[PDB]
Symmetry: C2
Subunit: 320 residues, 2 copies
C-alpha cells in the first residue's frame, strides 16, 4: 500500500521501508519534533561530502542580520560564479546540515559557489519574512561578492520544494527592485500555488512520502492569511504573463509521483508563455525531494538529475 | 627519501605521494595559505560523516563571545555526557570543518556529545588567549549543559596535537580554579614542551609529515615570549608532581614516527609519577596526526586507534 506502478525500484523499496517503519504523520508533530525527523533521517546515511569547503558568514542586509553558509569548490583559486541556495522543508523544517549533501552535489557538479541563506523558519516567522531575507541576501551577494570570493555579477538562484518557491519569488522580487541581475533560476520540484486541487494533488495525496496533509500543514505554518496566499510572492503561479516577463532562464525539474508536479509544470508553462527561456523536465519514477533525501542519493536517476542540475548551473554562470 | 623502516605501509605510501607532490615548506607560507593546505587536503577525500547532528552555538563566557560547534550522536534522546574538543593545526591552522571527520569518529564511537570550541588562531592572537577561551567554554558547558542537551557534570576534554596541549592545560586550569570537575582527558599526540631536543625530535626532524621546522614555526606564531613558554599552561611537561596531582584520568596516544612522541610519553610518565591514572599507548608505524588526516582515516591501525579513543571516552563518561 505504498507507491504506485512505475515508481523507480529503489524509491519504491524506500517507500515500503518507511511504511513498515510506521510513526505519526509528520504534520501531527511539534515543529521541533518534525525538524528532528529530517535531521535524523539525513544523518543515518553514509554520504560523500568531499570536494567542498564550507564557511559561515553573517551579513547585515536591509536592516537585519542574516546567517550564510558559503560552500566553495575545494582547491580552486580566484573568483567563482555563485548561486543562492534556498532550502526546502515546508518552511517548518530544514536547514543547512540536512541539505548539505544536496548543496554539495550542486557545488561539485557546477564548479560554482553556493550561498545557503539561513532564513527564519515557520511558524517562528510567517510570510513574507523568509523571502525578504532571501532577497536581501541575494542583493548583498551581488554587491559584496568579492568579500566571499565570488563574482556577484554572475549570480543564479536555486532551491528544492519551498526552496524552489523561494528561488522563483526572489527572481520576481529582483525584477520588481530592478536589481540584481540574475543568470538563471534552478527550481527543483517547486511549490508554486497555495491550492490543492491539481490532478497530481489528487492522485498522490498519500503513499508517496510528501502527502497532501503535509503540504496543507506547511502552508498553514507559513501563513493562514488568504490574501497573502493570493500574492504572486507566495503563489507565483498566479502571476500574469506581464508579471513574469523578463525573468531569468529557468530549469524546472518535477517528479512524476509528486503532488506538486502539476503546479511546477504549470509554472514552467506560464514562464514560457511570457517569453522566458525555460527547460522543463519531468523525472519519471521519482518522488518529491528525490535530490534532498539522502537514502535516495545513489539512485541512478537521482544521480542523473543532479548531474543535469549542476551542469545547467555551470552553463548559465560562465563568462560571457 | 620519505619515512623510515617500520612506517605502516599505507602511511609510507601517503608520505611518498606527498614527496612527489612537492610544494613549499608549510612554514614558508602565509597563515592564510597554510590554512588552505589543510582545508584542501581534508576536502579531497571521500569520508563517512554520518551518525551525527551538528549545531552551532555562540556563548558568553568570562567576558567574551565564543563560538561552539555541538556534535551530537544522531537519533538519540535525552541528556548525554560530553567532551570538549580542542582542534590541532599548530595554533595557526585548523578549524571545525578540517577536523570534522575526527570529531565525528569520536562522537559516533563514544556515544557522547562533542563541543568544538572555535578558539582564536595564531598569530591573530597569542598565548594565552586560546587556552583562556578553551577553559571558559569548558566551565560554561559544565554550568549550562542542559541548554545544549548534555549532562555538564559528566565532562571530559580531548584534542589532537596542540589540541592535546590545550586539553591538558584546560585540565590544569580547572584544577587551579577548583572547577569544573572532569572525568577524563584524551590527549592525541600532544604538544607538551616548548623545546626541540628530544630523541624523537632529532630522529624525525623531516620526512615524516610534521617537521621540526613546522613545530618551531607553530610555537613562534603562538608566542615568542620565552617566559610564557616556561609556564606550565604553555609547556605542561614543566609541571611538578605537586602541580599535576589530582588531574583527571588520561589516555595519551602517541605515534612512533612523530617528533612529539617523546614529550607526549614523558608527560604521561609525569602524570603517573604524580599519582594520576594514565593509559599511555604508542601506536607503532604511525605518523603525527594519524587521527586527523583524512587520507589516513581508513588505515586499519588508525581505525583501531579511533575505536580505542571513542571507547575510552565512553567508559569514563558513563553514569556512576
Amino acid at each position: 500500500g505504498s507507491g504506485s506502478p512505475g515508481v523507480e525500484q529503489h524509491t519504491q523499496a524506500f517507500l515500503e521501508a518507511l511504511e513498515q517503519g510506521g510513526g505519526k504523520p509528520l504534520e501531527q508533530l511539534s515543529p521541533k519534533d518534525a525538524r528532528a525527523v529530517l535531521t535524523g533521517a539525513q544523518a543515518s546515511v553514509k554520504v560523500d561530502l568531499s570536494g567542498i569547503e564550507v564557511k559561515e558568514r553573517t551579513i547585515q542586509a536591509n536592516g537585519q542580520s542574516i546567517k550564510l553558509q558559503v560552500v566553495r569548490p575545494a582547491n580552486v583559486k580566484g573568483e567563482l560564479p555563485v548561486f543562492m541556495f534556498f532550502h526546502g522543508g515546508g518552511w517548518v523544517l530544514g536547514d543547512f546540515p540536512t541539505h548539505q549533501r544536496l548543496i554539495r552535489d550542486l557545488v561539485v557538479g557546477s564548479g560554482a559557489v553556493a550561498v545557503y541563506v539561513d532564513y527564519t523558519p515557520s511558524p517562528e516567522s510567517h510570510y513574507p519574512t523568509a523571502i525578504n531575507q532571501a532577497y536581501a541576501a541575494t542583493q548583498w551577494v551581488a554587491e559584496h561578492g568579492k568579500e566571499i570570493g565570488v563574482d556577484g555579477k554572475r549570480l543564479a538562484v536555486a532551491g528544492n520544494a519551498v526552496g524552489g518557491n523561494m528561488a522563483a519569488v526572489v527572481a520576481l522580487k529582483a525584477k520588481e527592485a530592478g536589481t540584481p541581475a540574475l543568470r538563471f533560476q534552478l527550481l527543483l520540484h517547486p511549490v508554486t500555488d497555495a491550492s490543492f486541487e491539481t490532478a497530481s494533488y489528487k492522485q498522490f495525496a498519500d503513499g508517496h512520502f510528501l502527502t497532501t496533509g503535509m503540504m496543507k500543514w506547511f502552508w498553514d505554518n507559513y501563513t493562514t492569511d488568504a490574501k497573502a496566499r493570493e500574492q504572486i510572492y507566495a503563489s507565483p503561479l498566479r502571476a500574469s504573463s506581464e508579471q513574469l516577463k523578463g525573468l531569468p532562464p529557468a530549469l524546472v525539474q518535477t517528479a512524476e509521483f509528486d503532488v506538486l508536479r502539476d503546479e511546477g509544470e504549470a509554472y514552467a508553462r506560464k514562464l514560457n508563455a511570457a517569453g522566458v527561456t525555460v527547460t522543463s523536465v519531468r523525472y519519471n519514477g521519482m518522488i518529491h525531494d528525490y535530490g534532498l533525501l539522502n537514502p535516495l542519493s545513489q539512485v541512478p536517476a537521482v544521480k542523473a538529475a543532479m548531474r543535469q542540475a549542476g551542469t545547467e548551473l555551470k552553463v548559465h554562470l560562465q563568462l560571457e
